[PDB]
Amino acid sequence: PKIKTVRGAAKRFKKTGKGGFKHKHANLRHILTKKATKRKRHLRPKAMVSKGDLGLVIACLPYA
Amino acid sequence: GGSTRNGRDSEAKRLGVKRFGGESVLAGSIIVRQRGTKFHAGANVGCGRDHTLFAKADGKVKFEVKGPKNRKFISIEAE
Amino acid sequence: GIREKIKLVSSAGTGHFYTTTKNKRTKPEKLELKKFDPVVRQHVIYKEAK
RNA sequence: CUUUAAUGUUUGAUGUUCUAACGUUGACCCGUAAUCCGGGUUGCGGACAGUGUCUGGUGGGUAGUUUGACUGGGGCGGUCUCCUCCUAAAGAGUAACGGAGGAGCACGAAGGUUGGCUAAUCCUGGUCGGACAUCAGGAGGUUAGUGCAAUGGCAUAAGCCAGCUUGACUGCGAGCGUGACGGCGCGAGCAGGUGCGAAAGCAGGUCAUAGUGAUCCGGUGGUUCUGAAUGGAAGGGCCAUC
RNA sequence: UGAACUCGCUGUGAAGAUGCAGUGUACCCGCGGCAAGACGGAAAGACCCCGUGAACCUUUACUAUAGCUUGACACUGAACA
RNA sequence: GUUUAUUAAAAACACAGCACUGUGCAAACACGAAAGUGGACGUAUACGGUGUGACGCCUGCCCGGUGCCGGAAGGUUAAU
RNA sequence: AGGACCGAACCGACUAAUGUUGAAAAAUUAGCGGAUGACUUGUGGCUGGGGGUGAAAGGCCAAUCAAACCGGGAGAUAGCU
RNA sequence: UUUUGUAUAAUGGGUCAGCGACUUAUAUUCUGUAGCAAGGUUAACCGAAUAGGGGAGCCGAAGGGAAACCGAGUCUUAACU
Ligand SMILES: [Mg+2]
Ligand SMILES: [Mg+2]
Ligand SMILES: [Mg+2]
Ligand SMILES: [Mg+2]
Ligand SMILES: [Mg+2]
Ligand SMILES: [Mg+2]
Ligand SMILES: [Mg+2]
Ligand SMILES: [Mg+2]
Ligand SMILES: [Mg+2]
Ligand SMILES: [Mg+2]
Ligand SMILES: [Mg+2]
Ligand SMILES: [Mg+2]
Ligand SMILES: [Mg+2]
Ligand SMILES: [Mg+2]
Ligand SMILES: [Mg+2]
Ligand SMILES: [Mg+2]
Ligand SMILES: [Mg+2]
Ligand SMILES: [Mg+2]
Ligand SMILES: [Mg+2]
Ligand SMILES: [Mg+2]
Ligand SMILES: [Mg+2]
Ligand SMILES: [Mg+2]
Ligand SMILES: [Mg+2]
Ligand SMILES: [Mg+2]
Ligand SMILES: [Mg+2]
Ligand SMILES: [Mg+2]
Ligand SMILES: [Mg+2]
Ligand SMILES: [Mg+2]
Ligand SMILES: [Mg+2]
Ligand SMILES: [Mg+2]
Ligand SMILES: [Mg+2]
Ligand SMILES: [Mg+2]
Ligand SMILES: [Mg+2]
Ligand SMILES: [Mg+2]
Ligand SMILES: [Mg+2]
Ligand SMILES: [Mg+2]
Ligand SMILES: [Mg+2]
Ligand SMILES: [Mg+2]
Ligand SMILES: [Mg+2]
Ligand SMILES: [Mg+2]
Ligand SMILES: [Mg+2]
Ligand SMILES: [Mg+2]
Ligand SMILES: [Mg+2]
Ligand SMILES: [Mg+2]
Ligand SMILES: [Mg+2]
C-alpha cells in the first residue's frame, strides 16, 4: 500500500526550492513578558532545518 | 551534607590572536567575564554588556601592556 | 513572587500595548510612561498599570 | 394618571373524598376430569404502587489499569532543573552516592544621561558620650562598597550624592561564540522617533555570570489574510499577549 | 555420551587442571568391592535482581459499572378545602 | 466429629450454648435481563446474616475517628 | 438409654521401615483411629467455569485448578535467550 | 555461542541420513544500465489479446509568502544600503 505521511509533520514543515525545509521557531507562544524584544524579534522569522534533522524530516514526509 | 550540583557550560576563555577570524567585528578575542587584564585598546570596539570584546572591521589582533597599573589591552591593526 | 504582570496601553486610538511588571503593595499608584507607538510612529503616553 | 385593595378568571403547591386507568401470590364460576394460563362476577387497594427515558447520591459487588529512575546487589536514606569555586593535569571540554555554597527573585528607580564626590580601620583633642553615635586634625590608601551565594572585575570608578528624564524604544542587522538538535549568547552599523549634554558623545534595562518550562489545547486585543452557491457572519490564519 | 591414547604433586591459568609448565611415578587386560573427584546424572535456579512481563488478592490509588437509592416526564383520571 | 486425594490431622474447621442485628409475609435474603423458584406448603417460641464457642465466676471506661440508626430548622445542590 | 465402652467385617490414614529407572505416577509389612451413627455403601438424578461445591485447606470440579478441558481470534506480543 | 577476557570445571551437540531460518505484495528514495530529450509515460478498459487503441491522469520545465497576491523574483518593513 501507499506510505501514509505523518500529518503531525506535514503541518510542521514545508519544502523549499532546493529540497530544504522551513519551520517556525519555538519559544514564541506564551510567557512572553520576561523575554527580550531582541530575542522575540530574532525568533519571529522562519529558519531552515539542520543537517542532522533532515533524515528524520524526509522519513516523516515521503510525499512532500 | 550535599554534593554534586555544579554549574555547567563555563563558555570560553580565549578565541584567537592575530588574523585568526579577522573579517568584520568578530565576537572573540576576549576572556568573557574577565574585564581585568583584557580591556578595549580603542582599536577594537568596547566590551559588550557581558564584558565581551570584538573587532571593528579587520586586521591583526595584538596584546599589549601599557598605562598605569600595568593593565593588558587588546588592539587591532587596521589594514 | 508578589510582583505581578500589567499591560501599558497607548493613549492613542491604536490598540498597541506593552507589558511589564510592578509591585502592588509598595506602589499602588498608576504608572505613566512615554513610549514609542509603532502604529502611529510617535511617542505617546501609556496607562492602565494597576 | 398610581408608591396601593379585592368579586370573578388562569396557573402552581398541600390535604381529604371518589373510581374509570392500574395492582391483587383474596373468594367464587367457566374453558376443564388442570394449585399453570386465560375469561367472567365480586371484595380490597388505587391514580398510590410499579415499569420506560433522563437525572443527583452511594456502589472493591464486579472490571480495566497505574504504582519512576540513579544506586559500589536490591531495599531504607539521599538525589533528579539552574548558578559560583576546587577536583580539572597553565587553550576549550572532562566523571564519582567527590569536597564547599547559592537560585525558582528584586527595582518605575536600584534604568538612561549630565554634574559632582571618594573608603575601612586606628591615633590625638573635645559637654552629656561611654570600647563604639557626632565634631576637628593626623596616620592609612581600598584591608571599604556592590540589592542577594561564590569567582572574576571596578579609582576611569561598575562605589556615593543631586538635576532632567523613559533607550527597560519600534523594524533590521554584516560578523561571530556555544550546542547532536531544539536552542542560547555577543554584536558594530542602517531606517523611524525620543531623552540627557554647550558639544564631542552616551542610552535597544540593571558590574557580569542563577531568578526558569518545549509542543498541543484554549482565553483576551488588533488586522481587513481567508470566508464551502452569492452577500455577510461563524470558524481559521497572521501580530501582541495570558 | 564433542572426541579420547581418560596418573600423582607443585605452579600457571576465565582466578579450585587427566589434558598447560616443571617434575615424580607407572608392563597389557579383567573380576569383586568403597564412594574422594570427573565443579558427576536430572530440572533453561524456586533464593536475589531485571522486563516500561503475567496472573490473582486488598483498599479512604485512578477511571468505570451491576445493584440500591432521590427527583422530573410518560403510563396517569375526577371533585372539594 | 471435619480437614490440605498425593510431604502439614493440629492449638486449625464444625459443634451444642450465648449475644447483636434484619425480617409483618407477595417477609428479609438468594438464583434469574424476565417469568419464575428456594426461604416455606413455614409466620417473630419463625426465618436470614454476623461474632463468640460446653459448663462455672464474669465481661470495666471512651461515641473524638469510621460505620449504622434517628432528626417539617438552616446552608449547598442534579435533571427540568 | 447412650453422636456410651472393648473389639472383627466395613470406613479411615497417626508412627516406623521398605520401595523412589517401584510390584504401585502414594503402594507393601508391622503397629494405629472410628466401628448404632454428624455412620458407611450400591443404583439413578441435580448444581458448569469468574461459575459450581466447600464442618474452610484456595481444598475439589475425570492422574490438570489463585480460575477445568476442547476448538478458534492466532503466526497474540516478546526492547529477552 | 556469549564475552573485557574461555582448554576452561560457562552454554549446545551420542552418531549418521533427510528436512530446517532475510522471503512475497504494494508504495517511496538512491545507485547501475536501456529508451526517449523540455519533455517522459500511460491506468482502468477496448482489442484479431505480449501488437494496436486509450493521455483520464502523473512527474518535470518557477519560485516567494500563513494567505490574498506577486512572479525571476518574492517575503519582512512605513522602506531597506
Ligand atoms: Mg501566539
Ligand atoms: Mg480490582
Ligand atoms: Mg490491555
Ligand atoms: Mg499491571
Ligand atoms: Mg531500579
Ligand atoms: Mg546499594
Ligand atoms: Mg581548563
Ligand atoms: Mg591541558
Ligand atoms: Mg570523554
Ligand atoms: Mg545598580
Ligand atoms: Mg559621571
Ligand atoms: Mg549606575
Ligand atoms: Mg548583579
Ligand atoms: Mg457563503
Ligand atoms: Mg480571529
Ligand atoms: Mg590433580
Ligand atoms: Mg591446581
Ligand atoms: Mg571394577
Ligand atoms: Mg554404592
Ligand atoms: Mg574435563
Ligand atoms: Mg550437576
Ligand atoms: Mg535461567
Ligand atoms: Mg477426634
Ligand atoms: Mg480425609
Ligand atoms: Mg417464591
Ligand atoms: Mg474461635
Ligand atoms: Mg477461645
Ligand atoms: Mg460409640
Ligand atoms: Mg473401638
Ligand atoms: Mg498425613
Ligand atoms: Mg495397615
Ligand atoms: Mg472411643
Ligand atoms: Mg493461606
Ligand atoms: Mg484434578
Ligand atoms: Mg482470568
Ligand atoms: Mg489478531
Ligand atoms: Mg508464536
Ligand atoms: Mg533490554
Ligand atoms: Mg562475565
Ligand atoms: Mg587460554
Ligand atoms: Mg574456570
Ligand atoms: Mg565445555
Ligand atoms: Mg545461557
Ligand atoms: Mg550436554
Ligand atoms: Mg509555486
PDB file of C-alpha atoms (C1' of nucleotides) and ligand atoms in Angstrom, chain G residues 60-62 64-65, ligand 34:
ATOM      1  C1'   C G  60     -12.345 -30.467  44.870  1.00  0.00           C
ATOM      2  C1'   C G  61     -14.666 -29.927  39.809  1.00  0.00           C
ATOM      3  C1'   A G  62     -12.106 -37.049  35.152  1.00  0.00           C
ATOM      4  C1'   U G  64      -4.524 -30.999  35.324  1.00  0.00           C
ATOM      5  C1'   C G  65      -7.342 -25.709  39.466  1.00  0.00           C
TER       6        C G  65
HETATM    7 MG    MG I  34      -7.720 -32.879  39.328  1.00  0.00          MG
END
